[PDB]
Amino acid sequence: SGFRKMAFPSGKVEGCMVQVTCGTTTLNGLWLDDVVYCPRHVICTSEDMLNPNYEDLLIRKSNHNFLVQAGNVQLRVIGHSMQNCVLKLKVDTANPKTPKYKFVRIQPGQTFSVLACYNGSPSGVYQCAMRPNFTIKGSFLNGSCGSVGFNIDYDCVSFCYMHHMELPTGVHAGTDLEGNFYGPFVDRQTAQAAGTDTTITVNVLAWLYAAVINGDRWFLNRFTTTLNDFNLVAMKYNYEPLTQDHVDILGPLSAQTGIAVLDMCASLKELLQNGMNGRTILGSALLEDEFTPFDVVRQCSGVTFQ
Amino acid sequence: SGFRKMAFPSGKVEGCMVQVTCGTTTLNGLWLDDVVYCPRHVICTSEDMLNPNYEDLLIRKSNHNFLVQAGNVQLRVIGHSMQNCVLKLKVDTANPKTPKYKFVRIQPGQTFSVLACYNGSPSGVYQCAMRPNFTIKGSFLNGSCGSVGFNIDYDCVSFCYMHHMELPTGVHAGTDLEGNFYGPFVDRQTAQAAGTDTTITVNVLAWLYAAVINGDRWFLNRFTTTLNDFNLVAMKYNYEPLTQDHVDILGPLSAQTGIAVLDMCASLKELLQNGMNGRTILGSALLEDEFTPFDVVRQCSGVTF
Ligand SMILES: O=C(Cc1cc(F)cc(F)c1)Nc1cncc2ccccc12
Ligand SMILES: O=C(Cc1cc(F)cc(F)c1)Nc1cncc2ccccc12
């Protein structure tokens, strides 16, 4: 019993964190096999940040301009290349702590653990979701660039995010490990803003199923809804549209609890209308949207309480 | 910017988790140096749990009855002893991954990271607080016993909790690493209940300072209060008393934000008496009490390990 915002154990990623320095700028790098991945803006001065020409800035650098430190050991850079917004520094030592890994690009609503780092050293681990507006509501200070997001389903680390920047609202933007930004963001100091964010409906439904599995049913009602009527209501509270894919994905939780997806949708519609009336669901007075259907099945028991 | 419920990096603890099997029961063990620590109830059948005599159950076991697996490697148990509610299995191999560590007993209100494990395999890491009623609101399934709680101070892991049981309300009970339970709990299948819990006042104040540091100020007001008047209001709302030690501990956050501790207490008093009025603080509609003043400073300063 219990339901917590749970991150993956971070050890497999901690053994990959290194410090990358180029001139006066120091940030984090991810050392996997003989390559260190880091944000390409490590080669920029603060003045270069408005309209940097990364190809032009990079051509002026040699391997010895990149200082990579792993623990108290300086790695030797033997090659460098840029792939989209990520810099790949070939080093002369394969990381002996390289876990089984993959690079995965995620979709909005997906969750992942972030290992926040500074100067190549891990500071903490927390759980995030890729918001519908492609930002993440992280906790990052200056020096956190290059910190990564990941999942570890089995013993394989799927790296899905590398931190690049903080937007004016205090939310964060980054790339996949191939250097492609999530969202319409660029690694430039030009005026950029997070679009209006919305609630991840499928995740709220998953979390309501988590509450039912853990023994709470106060919020259920005798009603059902069509998918279209649910979407017309939910959009009025800035909730993401629920697709038939989302309904299918919630099938297993629906079968385990005995509550049809559209019946749980009717419960959510009522919660949006009524609020919680002094009650909580899984220790929260707000509807939680940073647990996916996959997270709920992984965290919760396979036996519903009642 | 941003403020998240953040756990310590778990790698140093992951390298210590092992699987301990005794008969039909499998749970987690903590392998440090040449000793594996685990809940003593690993030696019990369901019948034994009703009223166990752990000394009597243990005397019937030999070293080979304990199967300890560190990954895909079977460790050989060369001795066994009980310390309070923890079983200590001496093994022939010192854990090469043993970090610098200490065993510390924490006080209610203190937070720690839990590395939830099943079959000696870490599954998740989360941050929680030792409640004033000595339970933890964890997330644990069957097989999670022996999962540990810890903090990191510099390069040293301070182990403070070992998971033993789940109470009927779904909250959790465990011991320090010396096997002393937190709270009035016993490792036996007998009627036990979590006592009425209270809110960790100093932690709510720390989180309000975190909200201010993050640009959330709507709850600030021109008012101050005395410590005694604040504690009268705290008692009324099932909040823990705020001591002068708590006020001193919040000094640095008070100096950084310009909001004196008693000035923040008057914000907290108004929030308790009136609610949030449809507003949120750091994305929460409830007052969060599972961040200590140290956690707030650490997260807002970027301390690494
Ligand atoms: O955003 C940047 C630097 C940057 C600026 C830019 F215009 C484009 C970039 F790709 C990167 N750094 C930070 C990242 N995360 C959190 C932070 C918090 C405070 C101060 C800086 C933080
Ligand atoms: O509570 C126990 C076993 C136990 C029973 C007892 F009566 C006394 C004990 F010291 C230990 N194990 C569990 C721990 N955490 C979570 C669980 C969730 C579901 C089922 C069991 C869970």
XYZ file of C-alpha atoms in Angstrom, chain B residues 45-172:
128
model
C 6.420 -18.800 9.119
C 2.896 -17.166 9.183
C 2.121 -19.194 12.348
C 5.405 -18.047 13.996
C 4.452 -14.384 13.341
C 1.349 -14.750 15.567
C 3.570 -14.890 18.686
C 7.243 -15.353 17.784
C 10.076 -16.308 20.090
C 12.871 -15.101 17.856
C 15.670 -16.567 20.035
C 13.964 -19.992 19.860
C 13.307 -19.751 16.112
C 16.896 -18.587 15.446
C 18.622 -21.293 17.512
C 17.048 -23.883 15.144
C 18.712 -22.292 12.080
C 22.165 -22.983 10.770
C 24.244 -20.609 8.581
C 23.356 -22.632 5.440
C 19.603 -22.061 6.090
C 20.184 -18.398 5.043
C 20.595 -18.006 1.298
C 22.064 -14.607 0.441
C 22.325 -13.509 -3.177
C 24.240 -10.397 -4.273
C 23.092 -10.096 -7.880
C 23.690 -13.505 -9.450
C 26.318 -14.460 -6.811
C 25.506 -16.549 -3.753
C 27.306 -15.286 -0.618
C 28.172 -17.829 2.069
C 26.818 -17.106 5.542
C 29.487 -17.910 8.185
C 27.661 -16.592 11.276
C 24.352 -15.196 12.471
C 23.210 -13.089 15.371
C 20.259 -10.918 16.315
C 20.430 -7.295 17.460
C 16.986 -6.124 18.568
C 14.658 -6.666 15.510
C 17.475 -7.034 12.968
C 19.262 -10.187 11.986
C 22.979 -9.857 11.191
C 24.357 -12.491 8.860
C 28.114 -12.644 8.837
C 29.322 -13.493 5.319
C 32.810 -14.594 4.129
C 33.151 -11.682 1.674
C 33.334 -7.992 2.492
C 31.175 -5.968 0.069
C 33.660 -4.283 -2.264
C 31.026 -1.615 -2.922
C 30.647 -0.697 0.803
C 30.427 3.103 0.903
C 31.581 5.290 3.832
C 28.594 4.825 6.172
C 27.094 5.284 9.585
C 23.986 4.023 11.324
C 21.929 6.942 12.629
C 18.605 6.990 14.383
C 16.463 9.878 13.172
C 13.782 11.943 14.910
C 10.188 12.491 13.706
C 10.116 15.258 11.103
C 13.459 14.232 9.644
C 13.328 13.171 6.006
C 15.172 10.413 4.189
C 15.295 8.613 0.875
C 13.927 5.103 0.612
C 15.316 2.689 -1.941
C 12.387 0.293 -2.385
C 13.670 -3.217 -3.257
C 12.211 -6.594 -4.157
C 14.281 -9.788 -4.367
C 17.432 -7.784 -3.586
C 16.817 -5.627 -6.685
C 16.226 -1.856 -6.301
C 12.952 -0.840 -7.898
C 12.487 2.795 -6.956
C 13.668 5.686 -4.864
C 11.475 8.150 -3.025
C 11.752 10.782 -0.375
C 9.679 10.628 2.797
C 9.578 11.841 6.385
C 9.420 10.032 9.680
C 5.944 11.119 10.782
C 5.394 12.456 14.339
C 3.484 9.137 14.955
C 6.680 7.246 13.921
C 5.203 5.745 10.776
C 6.313 6.517 7.256
C 3.855 6.988 4.399
C 5.846 4.757 2.054
C 4.937 2.846 -1.063
C 5.694 -0.770 -0.380
C 4.363 -4.101 -1.591
C 4.944 -7.654 -0.257
C 8.647 -8.467 -0.629
C 9.790 -4.914 0.227
C 10.892 -5.762 3.799
C 14.538 -4.988 4.344
C 14.410 -1.970 1.955
C 16.324 0.891 3.594
C 16.066 4.608 4.230
C 19.090 6.843 4.195
C 20.577 10.323 3.937
C 23.927 11.387 2.484
C 26.123 13.976 4.258
C 29.203 14.619 2.046
C 30.390 11.125 0.832
C 28.918 9.231 3.838
C 25.665 7.287 3.748
C 23.728 7.554 7.011
C 21.384 4.553 7.094
C 18.381 5.419 9.244
C 15.553 3.008 8.399
C 14.937 -0.599 7.514
C 11.430 -1.531 6.412
C 9.655 -4.201 8.475
C 5.870 -3.947 8.142
C 2.714 -2.368 6.864
C 0.008 -1.248 9.298
C -3.752 -1.631 8.491
C -4.080 1.994 7.292
C -1.442 1.353 4.583
C 1.339 3.285 6.382
C 4.681 1.662 7.277
